[PDB]
Every structure is written in C-alpha cells, then in structure tokens.
C-alpha cells in the first residue's frame, strides 16, 4: 500500500527524504520552515503572526499582549513594593509602559479582594516595580499589568527545546491592529504568487496563541491549551467595552491567578471574550481560506498553537471553508478531538512524538511511545476515522533511530490497511453516551485537558474517562447544562456521565443547586435512564449540610465532608461477583485475605460494615476521601480502605453508578464499558461483538461484512470473539496486533 | 504511702474486698463492708431508676428533634415514614405537642419549609402525608420525639444481652413536677444513706446525643451533643429570653445534629448558654444538698453531663468536690485532669473488671499497664488526685498476675504524687490550640465518640494525644479570643488543625482580615504557627489561595482552579532538625536518591521526587498540597504533594503538617516542630530524652526530675540537663527513674 501519509522534509536531505517517502508510502511532503522532483502533494506551513521581524520591529506596539499577575507580596507596614517581572521570562514578556498603567492595570489587595485605588500607587520610572501606599498592613498584594509578548511562545518553546542558542527570536504580531493586518494580508497575497508549487497551505496556525507563559528560570509558568490570555490590547479592550457595554477588569483575565483555566466554572466575561475574539478570528480566517482557494490551493488548519477564537466545534465553523484540520495525536482522546470536527472535507493526524531532541536523543527508544500512541489512536480511529496521518519535525533526527523508523513503517501500513478494509467508515456503535458539563459540544473531547496530550496527577483519573470512551464501541456526545435546562434530555440517550472534582466546569458547580436540573436528571433516570458519576459528580458545596453530591440518591453514594461525623455510616457487604467487575482478575491470595479478615462490626462513632482488608485489583487513580453508601440498598462493588470506589444503585427503572476515578488502561476501558451496558439495563446487549480477553476490543462493520479485533497491549493476547449469532471465534494476537475477519 | 485509690466491691465478697483493699492501698470503696473504715462511694442516677414516677407523667420524658430519611416525591404527593430509620424502643413521636406548631416538613432539594396546610400526621401510623409539592425533590420531617428509654441504660442492655429486663425510662427536670420529684427523692435518699461519703453522680440531667436505629445499632452519637435537651416548654422559654424563635432545623442541622465539628452558629451557642444556666443551677442544688448532709458530690465526666460545661467560667461556683472520668488514653486523662473548678479529680482506669477481658486465656495485665502508661505521661503534665477501677472485683481476683500488676500501679501512682507534691511538671514552651471553641472544649477537639478516634479523625486527634503527655504547657483558645484581645504575649506556638469548614480549622472566620492581620503580624514578630491538614482554609474566598495563611506555612492546597500554573518543588531537605529522630530506611533513601526529581514538563510543573522517601506516617492524605514558592523548605513531599514543610516568616516561622497520627516518633516530630518553629532549637536539649520512647519531667522547685518509659520494652536513654550535663538511664519495661 501507499499514501494517506504526510512526510516532513528538511533542506540538504534529499536522498533520505526520497528513501523515507518510499518506505513510509508518503503522498504529501510538508516542507521545512528533491521535494519538487518527487511530485508528491506539497504542504507549506504558514505562520501568519510571525516570521517577519523586519515588520514588527517597526511597529512594536502591535505585538500581542497579555495580562500578567505578579507574585503576592506581603505589606509589613501600610505600603508595599511589587516587582513586576521577577517571576516572568524577560525574553518573552515586557511590561507595556505605553498604555496608561492607571487606566489598564489593577493593584489588588488579595486578602480582601479589593482593588487598590490608582491614586495609591505609582509605576517606578527606572525599574519594573509598582510602589503602593495607603493600604492595610499584613495583607498580600499583587499587580495585574499589561505586557507585550516579544517572543512567539511556540517558536520560543521550539528554540529552547532545540537549544538554538543565539538564533534570532521571532517576535509575534497581532492583526487586531490595522497596520499589521494589512501587512499580513499583503504578504500572504505575494507569498501565494511566489509559491506556485504549493498544493496545501498548512496554517500553523492563525492569529491568537493559546496561553503559554514562561518564568524567570526559562521554565513553563502558565499553560492552557484553550486559554485566551494572549489576546488583549488597549484597543481591543476599549472596543470590547463599546460593543459589550461594560469594561473588563484585568481581573477578568488573570482570574485570581487561575487565568480562566477551562477547569473553572465559566463566567460570563469569559464567554463574552470568546464571542468577541471568535467573530474577529473567523472573519479573517475566511479571507485567508478564500485567498488560498482563488490561488488554486487548499487551506488546512493546525488544531493548536494559534487556534484561539476558531472554535471548531461551534456552529458556523463550516462557513470558513477550510478544507482540512490537521492535529497532534498522542492518544485516543486527541485523535477524537480532530476526527469528530464536522465542518471540513478531511482530517489529518500528525502523530507524536514530534521529531525533536527531547524525545530523539541517544539512549532513548522512541519506538515504545510511538507504538503506545498508535495503539491508543487506533481504537479511536476505528470509532471515528481520520483521512490521513503523518509526522513532524526534523526528519534527519528520526532517521537516526532505526527501530523507530521501522515502527513508523508498521503504523503507516496498518493505517492504510485499516482504511482499505473498512472503506474509511466508522464502526457500528452500540449505546448512546452523553458527557454532561458546563461547556458541552464546543469542548468535544476537550474536557480535563490542561496541556495538550499531557494528563497529570490531578487530571488523569478523569481524562481516563474520555480516553476509555475514545475507542469504545459506543456513540459519544458532549452536552451542556444549558442544553439540558433548555431542552431536557434527548430521547436517544442511554447514559449520561458527569465527572470531575467539585467546583469545576466538569462537574458544574452551583448549577447542581438549580432544582430544574436535578428534577430533569432524576425523572429521566427513574424512567429508565442511566447516570454514571465519577469523582465528585453533581457536587455543590455548602448548599445542603447533609448532602454533597446533589444526586447522591441516584448513584447511592455521597462524600462525607466532616459535617456528618455524628451519623454512623453502615456499609452493606461488597458483591465481588458482579457483571460490572466480571473481567477484573483478583489474585487468589488477595481475595482470600479479603475474605478472611471480614467486615468491621458496628462501633460507636465508627459505623460498621467496612472491609478490614481491601479486595483491590482495580486502579481507580486519585482517591475521593470518605465516600460512603447512602443506604444499605446500594450495591458496593469496591469499597476498600473504609470508603467507596465503585457502586451501582437501582433508581426506579434506571440505574446510577459511582466510580471514584478511572485512569485509562485496557482493563479500565472494559470496566467502564460494562458500567454503560449494566447501568442502561443492556447487559443482554453486551455479549454480541464482545472480546473475552479484557485487553482486546472488537469493531463491527456491518456494511463491509467485517469485524476486526485489536490487541490494546504490547503483549501477546489470545481472545475469543462472540458474534451476534452466538457463535465464538478465536484469535492469537501478537504484541499491539490486529486481526480481521 | 496508702490511699488515692478507689476499689470496686460486690455482694458476698467481704473477705476478698478487705484483702485487695489492703494489697492495693485502697481508701475508698464503690458499688456489710459498709462497716470498714473506708470512704464509701454510691452512684446516683438523677434522671432514671424511677419508672413509677415517669410512667404517670410521660409527657415529661426528655425529647429530641429527629430527622427522617429523605423521601423522593415522584408526583405532587409524598408520604414520609417518621420512625422507619429509628429504634422504636428508644424513641416515639410526640403526638401531644401540636405537630403543626413544633415540626417542620422540608423540601431538601430547595431548602424551603413546606407549609403546614400541605401536610397532615396520620392518626393511626407514624407517617406524614404531604401534598401540593414538587415531583423529583427529596423531603424530610423534623419531628419532636419522646425518649422513652435512657440511652446509656439501653446501650448497656443491648451490649450485655439483658433480654426481658425492664427498660428504664428517663425524665427531664425542666418540667416542674419531675424537678420537684427528683429533689424530694434525693432529699429522702440522703436521709436513708448514712454510710455514703461520696455521691457519685452518673451523671446529671441531660444525656449526650446517643440515638439508635431500626436495626438496634447506633445511629447518631456526639459526646458533646445537645440534641436530647428539648421540650415545648424549653423552646418557648428560649424565645422569651433570646428574643427569637428556634426552628427544628436549628437542632437537626440538615442531618448533622450540631456535631462539635460544625462551625458553631449563634443559635447553638445561645442554646448551650440557655441549657447550661438551667443545668448549673440544678447541679449546685444537688451539691448543696449533699454537703448539708455531710457528703461529697462527685460528677462523672460523661453520660448525662450536657450543660455542665466544666471548662467554662463559673464551674467552681457549683461547689462540686470532684470529677471522676474514664481514662481511655492521654487526651481523655487531660480532659479530667485540667478541670480547675473542683477540689480533686479521679480517673477510672482500664480494664473494666468484666468477662469481656477477664476470661481464661487472656492476660488483662497487658491492657492494665498499657492504660497506665498512656495516662501516666499525661499525669506528669497535669496531676490527677486519685485512681481506681470499676466492675466485678470477684473477676479481677481470679487473675493473680493482674492483681500483682495493680499492686505495682497503685504504688507507683502514690509514689509520683508524693515525690511531685501533686504539682505539674515544668512546661518548656507555651502552646495554644486555636479553634472555634477554645477553652470550653479543652482536650475535646476532634472527638466524636469518647476515646474512639476513627479514619476521619485520627490524623488530628493524634495532635492532642501527642501533646497530652508532652513537656510543654498547652492551652485552648478561640478565634473570638484572638479577635477581642490579640494573641497573648506569653504564647510560643499556635497550632491550627483540621479539615476545611470545621470548628477546628475555623471556616469563614479566616476571611476576616483582622484575624489574618493579627496572626501574620504575630508570626512576623517571632511567633510560630503550625498548621495541620487544611489550616486556615476558606473555600471559594480567593480563587488562588485556599489556606488563607499559605504564605506563613509555605504550602497551599490545589483546588483544581489553578491547574494552569506549573508548580515547582524545591529539592527535599532530608537532614533537618525537625526530622532528626525519624527512623532512617537506607534502601528507601537509596532508591529515592537514585530516582531523582521530575524535570519540568508542560502542564505538570517539576521538582517532585520520582520515588517516595517515606519513613513517616502522616495519616489521611491532603491531596495536591504544593509549595507556594521555592524558598519554602520541603521536609517530606512524596507522591507529587507535600506532607511536611517549614517556612521562615520575618522573625518567626510557619510549619505545615498534612496529618499526625499519634506515635512515639510522631509525638517527637511534633515536639521538634514546636521548638524549631519558635526559634528555640537551643532550648530543645534541656530536660529531654534522646530516646523518643521515653519522656522527661522536670520539677525545678522540688529540685528533681524523672524519666519515664512509655513502652512495655526496655529502653536506654540519655537525659540532658539544663547545664548541658547528661545522665544515662536503662529503664525497665514501663519504668520510671528519679534524680536530683
Ligand atoms: C497541538 C498543539 O497545540 N501543540 C503544541 C505544540 O505546538 C507546542 O510546541 C507545545 C508547547 O508546550 O504545546 C502544544 O503541545
Ligand atoms: C465518658 C463517657 O461518657 N462514656 C460513655 C459510656 O458510659 C457509654 O456506655 C458509651 C456508649 O457508647 O459512651 C461513652 O463511652
Ligand atoms: Mg515563581
Ligand atoms: Mg505538483
Ligand atoms: Mg456552614
Ligand atoms: Mg438508615
Ligand atoms: Mg404502609
Ligand atoms: Mg414558659
Ligand atoms: Mg467560583
Ligand atoms: Mg525498611
């Protein structure tokens, strides 16, 4: 096979480019920032807001800008001096002294939340320090100040990662300003004329870079892949005031030091700013796409970098007329972020690892992550196909890693074989599952992300929900509390999942104190709905003394918040042999120890029924302390260490399930899959197209008269598939393998 | 020396009673041996043991507001069973006091009280019929119930399988007829009890919250709880005095029943004041009567002790001769010992003389000595006057090793008293525990059921257990104290500990800038602040700061609002004064050193150790604590978060500890924390034991010190004296040594 593969080229590397193009079956080449001779489709990456220092050096007040929050400084008398730049990278960020600081900045008493009157502070003429007087001693104070971004965040990251030393730093520019906007469009018009051979303009990306701010030690300081920090200017702020009827505070951006993280329950000012920016971004993206098209070229957008304000999952994205979106793939969730976008002709995955020396260094084996990423993306692709794949970075760097080079040959062949055999259509999905949160559709597959593709200690127990779902045999949608409150719950939905910690966009915050939301979900489950809550689902703090999870009644579990310690909690015996946990292997010795130690007997002020030893066997990630069964009719499936990890509760005709956390693994995907079939009273439907081995999965393509079976592990796996007729069929899959039937 | 010892006795056991009295140096006997020359204690139970009275005045039993289970409405009607979740042998809905006046039906989904016109109480079953309500909401009734079985007598019946034995019905002296009966009966009992020297009141008028469920298990307990203290009469009177009307909700408290862990509300404090005035007047009368009859009056610190408030000003005005209480551990010893307003104090030690521990094959002396050692370390810091045991002497007599053990304990209790003159050891630092309650709950923080710390509490209770026998002076202060008067200038260290939104951390008081100013200024001037768990926490006040004093202690807790900000952890300092006595684990240290620290990665911060150093039991985790800057000293920061840290703050210091279960090592850890945080490292060595399993008590007046072995194993230790000289000791099992 050949094709559906983009190769990155490099100058003075003609022979090996040609050799790798042949080896990997490349049908497009993405040129550096014999490619003509190969006669493949040509992509040129285009950088609308950088790569022209000779422009922006003449117009330095037109760089993009950001509100920055200083460290908190303690007043030891009725005065404080606050250094502006001590905690920031001075090669990236410069305080804006041009735009009246008393109009644009804010000094805040963080101990009280009060804005300090601008009459009480002065900016030092000679150093980046604000002097404050007439304030309370023993409070903490900060400045929120406008800063110019004098180094493109991503180009800077590239420089630092590659140790480019004294190579000139690229200064970014902001097309909000008419001079720069005219420059960008004029320059693009000429580039088009000067680039007759380019087939695809790969905009990498457009106008506003996601929040990416570095510190005084040259480390990342603040990151949010969705963040709008790097999008302000005196002019845009003043224009916003005229258009929206109110003036944004610096606080509306720095957000008490949260910088409007996507995890924060979204505020109207955030939504308004997104609306303001997107109208402007989309208008200008449309013009770039129209120019590309008139020049006989395709317009392709990278899902990342300067993608702020594009909103690929908001209505109207299709009207931009972008031909394609290409995105970074490191797993199934990030695959689906790209694959599910409706408004384009085709999609492309640029697989991790990027060809940079942070991964490609002597002693490291990149083929391991390479194939791990593929296994995770592969299951997602079977559920929602992407048209094309490829890689990025220095081809000469990857070329020196023969094992990885072989791994890419394997992946590329298998990608093509999957497309060829499936005809590029999605596998048949078996249940309709809706993730409910504050954002809904606009953040499809985007819940729980902070840095793209990089879940961490704080997030992985929830990101694992999406990762499991990304390659699972169900149909997944993303809905918001606004949707549910305006329209109820759609009659085709089988299961609603609500997951995350308390007081976030993902659980929903005080929306759970809205009686109409509680009524809607309760009535729907009672009628045969299924509600799966993960971590602190439906949580609303200090609304009811005795109830933290507002839907504790549904899922059978609440979290003790140290207000109800007088109330003895009684745990019913765990049911170790249950549909949901059927695929969990428990060590015989572990199960014996659990059986032998028994359950706590009631003791004053200590409740009773908790297992003295754990049953274990499931990685539930981060604990939720002191979860407990609300009554003895809930079924406990895991309740180790004196609290609950896993429970199911009958609620009228439907069911609630509680999961304390769910990091991704093949086994946990199976656990969640059993949860969805069980909670919706569809246990009967599970058998058809199931894999006996928990670490393998099946994808059924009725149209092609076909099914495949994938091994989700780097180990050999034997498995038995059950067809819809009842008959079984056996497989012996090698490491990371696939078979078709 | 003889005496300071109370012996239990029983019918037909005169011979052995005299023998053991002589062997143990007993000077008191409790329940024909009435004719021995000993002080005679008789228990008195003012609110029970008189079913002949109360069965003719059943509207005068004590009452309690009860909260039903939450019932889901699936239409505009809902029926709420009143009694399905409660023990019907203990509790009965009050049908005499107009339910529409005294009860509340609540929509828990909205918090609104359902109007009287929308509900009725079924005439024939204990069910409330609600109509005109919203489908898919949860509803509850808060109803008055008579308590028809004394809760402690009930507990003993259930625990000891007393079967068909008559249930004792309790009664409430708030009603004048019952009150008059209680006093007339006592007047007559005193007349009829000439050989009684000490009336052991067990206890007085109101039982601590103790409610059982339909399965005969405990449902709700609070050793401090005021639930079982209401009546229509008392509720109306409170309104008369305080000028506002209490709701049933002021008692049920959303299902929390006013747990001492709840940040206290004005209505709770007003109720305590209301109740305590009544209880106190009536206790004084009982004590006055005892005294007029030539008897002493002794209060049990427990059971019906609600409203006595032994740590509140004016307790001394009662004229109680003594408090006796249950010795469960060091903390519970201090609860008794520190009470200032009585003439003497008495501990009832373990084991109780009962077949549950006194059975063939068991060795009760182990528990006996465990109990003594736990109490003894506290007694050196705050002496108690007397010891003793309870239960069946005939059972203890059958265990000769146990008898020999008690002989030793009693002799040692008296020896300590004699050598020290009943004076507290010198304290080396002044430590104040700061919470919502302060002095009125001295040694009482973190308790739910007496002497029964559990998963949710032990990480904080260990603070008190550590301090209970520690060589420092401990006081309990409130936020109200600090706001009114500032921080007393003799205090060296303040400790604030507990989870967020509890009386122990303080709740929204930490958003009051005067509190923050006062504490910060005081630390900056050389004070020491030790915060444990979620100290100074205030939820949703500042987006970027959860612990309001994170700047002092150098640690905050990530609340998933600030995930965009990379957290950078400085390298841990494994060799430090604070952790100098933590047992080293060479293999753990080796693997930790070898694995190194995480390098910065986007969205993941950096600097966290890849493997844990470990070595310290911090109890329950506080997830995602992080250092606020890189100048904080991390002492333990395993598993991507912080357990132990110290931060300089002007002249003073802050220390963060995520949790502190009691142990010898952890009490040493806390002790080193106190000396270090107060810049008193140079003062640490004076009057100290090198071995953490031993403790030192200095009596500068008596020109004396002792060193005690807190374990049942031999312990060598070196004691350092004020002048820098040292002395080595080889302490036997449970031993003690005295020196000049
Ligand atoms: C898909 C996307 O936006 N990728 C960017 C990448 O370009 C950038 O170099 C990196 C910096 O940390 O962050 C993200 O991974
Ligand atoms: C000191 C005190 O009040 N002790 C009581 C005890 O009398 C009672 O039997 C028990 C019931 O659970 O509770 C407490 O332990
Ligand atoms: Mg910093
Ligand atoms: Mg061509
Ligand atoms: Mg509250
Ligand atoms: Mg119950
Ligand atoms: Mg019935
Ligand atoms: Mg009256
Ligand atoms: Mg908020
Ligand atoms: Mg070891």
Swiss-Prot record, chain A:
The keyword rRNA-binding does not apply. Its EC number is 2.4.1.211. It catalyses: beta-D-galactosyl-(1->3)-N-acetyl-D-glucosamine + phosphate = alpha-D-galactose 1-phosphate + N-acetyl-D-glucosamine. Keywords: Carbohydrate metabolism, Glycosyltransferase, Transferase. InterPro entries: Class_I_gatase-like (IPR029062), Glyco_hydro_b (IPR013780), Ig-like_fold (IPR013783), Lact_bio_phlase-like_N (IPR035080), Lacto-N-biose_phosphorylase (IPR012711), LBP_C (IPR035356), LBP_M (IPR035363). One of its GO terms (molecular function) is 1,4-alpha-oligoglucan phosphorylase activity. It is an enzyme of class 2 (transferase). It comes from the Bacteria. Changing residue 356 to N: Decrease in activity. Gene3D superfamilies: 3.40.50.880, Glycosidases, Golgi alpha-mannosidase II, Immunoglobulins. Disulfide bonds: none annotated. The active site is at residue 305. GO terms for biological process: carbohydrate metabolic process. Coiled coil: none annotated. Homodimer. Belongs to the glycoside hydrolase 112 family. Reversibly phosphorolyzes lacto-N-biose to Gal1-P and N-acetylglucosamine (GlcNAc) and galacto-N-biose to Gal1-P and N-acetylgalactosamine (GalNAc). Involved in the lacto-N-biose I/galacto-N-biose (LNB/GNB) degradation pathway, which is important for host intestinal colonization by bifidobacteria. NCBIfam families: 1,3-beta-galactosyl-N-acetylhexosamine phosphorylase. This is 1,3-beta-galactosyl-N-acetylhexosamine phosphorylase. It comes from Bifidobacterium longum subsp. longum (strain ATCC 15707 / DSM 20219 / JCM 1217 / NCTC 11818 / E194b).
């Amino acid at each position: 096979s050949t094709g559906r593969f983009t190769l990155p080229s490099e100058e003075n590397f003609a022979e090996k480019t040609k050799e790798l193009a042949e080896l990997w079956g490349a049908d497009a080449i993405r040129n550096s920032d014999a490619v003509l001779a190969l006669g493949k489709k040509i992509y040129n990456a285009y950088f609308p807001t950088r790569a022209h220092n000779e422009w922006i050096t003449l117009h330095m007040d037109e760089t993009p800008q950001v509100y920055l929050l200083t460290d908190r400084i303690l007043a030891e008398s009725d005065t404080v001096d606050i250094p502006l730049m001590e905690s920031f990278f001075a090669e990236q960020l410069k305080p804006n002294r041009d735009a009246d600081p008393h109009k644009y900045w804010e000094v805040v008493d963080r101990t009280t939340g009060e804005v300090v009157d601008s009459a009480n502070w002065t900016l030092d003429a000679d150093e980046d320090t604000v002097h404050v007087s007439g304030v309370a001693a023993w409070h903490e104070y900060t400045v929120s100040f406008l800063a110019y971004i004098i180094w493109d965040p991503v180009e800077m990251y590239n420089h630092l990662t590659n140790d480019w030393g004294d190579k000139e730093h690229e200064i970014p520019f902001d097309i909000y300003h008419p001079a720069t906007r005219k420059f960008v469009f004029d320059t693009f018009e000429q580039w088009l004329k000067d680039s007759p051979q380019t087939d695809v303009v790969r905009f990498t990306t457009f106008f506003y870079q996601f929040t990416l701010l570095f510190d005084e030690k040259r480390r990342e300081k603040v990151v949010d892949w969705f963040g709008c920090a790097c999008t302000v200017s005196p002019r845009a702020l003043d224009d916003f005031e005229a258009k929206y009827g109110y003036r944004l505070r610096p606080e509306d951006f720095v957000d008490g030091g949260a910088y409007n993280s996507a995890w924060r329950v979204p505020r109207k000012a955030q939504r308004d700013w997104i609306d303001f920016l997107s109208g402007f971004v989309r208008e200008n993206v449309k013009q770039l796409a129209d120019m590309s098209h008139a020049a006989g070229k395709e317009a392709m957008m990278f899902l990342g970098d300067q993608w702020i304000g594009t909103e690929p999952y908001k209505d109207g994205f299709d009207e931009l007329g972008l031909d394609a979106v290409v995105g970074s793939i490191g797993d199934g969730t990030t695959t689906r972020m790209i694959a599910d976008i409706p408004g384009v002709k085709y999609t492309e995955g640029r697989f991790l690892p990027y060809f940079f020396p942070d991964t490609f260094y002597e002693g490291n084996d990149p083929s391991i992550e390479g194939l791990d990423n593929w296994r995770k993306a592969r299951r997602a692709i079977l559920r929602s196909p992407i048209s094309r794949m490829g890689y990025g970075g220095y081809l000469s760097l990857a070329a020196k890693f023969p094992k990885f080079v072989d791994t890419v040959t394997h992946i590329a062949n298998e990608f093509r074989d999957i497309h060829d055999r499936t005809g590029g259509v999605a596998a048949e999905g078996e249940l309709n599952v809706a993730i409910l949160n504050s954002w809904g559709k606009m953040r499809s597959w985007m819940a729980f992300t902070v840095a793209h593709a990089l879940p961490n200690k704080q997030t992985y127990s929830y990101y694992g929900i999406l990762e499991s779902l990304s390659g699972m045999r169900v149909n997944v949608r993303f809905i918001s509390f606004d949707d549910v409150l305006a329209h109820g719950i759609d009659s085709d939905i089988d299961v609603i999942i609500n997951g995350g910690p308390v007081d976030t966009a993902f659980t929903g915050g005080d929306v759970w104190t809205n009686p109409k939301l509680v009524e809607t979900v309760r009535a729907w489950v009672r009628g045969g709905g299924a509600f799966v809550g993960v971590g602190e689902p439906s949580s609303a703090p200090r609304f009811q003394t005795g109830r933290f999870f507002q839907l504790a009644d549904v899922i059978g579990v609440d979290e003790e918040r140290y207000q109800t310690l007088s109330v003895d909690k009684y745990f019913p015996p765990v049911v170790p042999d249950h549909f949901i946990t059927a695929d969990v292997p428990v060590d015989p010795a572990a199960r014996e120890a659990w059986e032998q130690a028994g359950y706590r007997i009631p003791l004053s002020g200590c409740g009773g029924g908790q297992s003295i030893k754990p049953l274990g066997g499931i990685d539930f990630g981060e604990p939720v302390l002191n979860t407990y069964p609300v009554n003895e009719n809930v079924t406990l499936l895991r309740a180790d260490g004196g609290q609950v990890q896993l429970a199911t509760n009958d609620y009228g005709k439907g069911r609630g399930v509680y999961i304390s956390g769910l990091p991704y693994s093949a086994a946990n995907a199976r656990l969640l899959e059993r949860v969805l079939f069980y909670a919706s009273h569809n246990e009967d439907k599970y058998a058809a197209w199931s894999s006996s081995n928990p670490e393998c999965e099946v994808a059924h393509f009725p149209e092609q008269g076909l099914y495949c079976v994938i091994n989700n592990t780097d180990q050999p796996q034997k498995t038995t598939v059950t067809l819809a007729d009842g008959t079984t069929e056996d497989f012996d899959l090698p490491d990371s393998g696939i078979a078709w039937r």
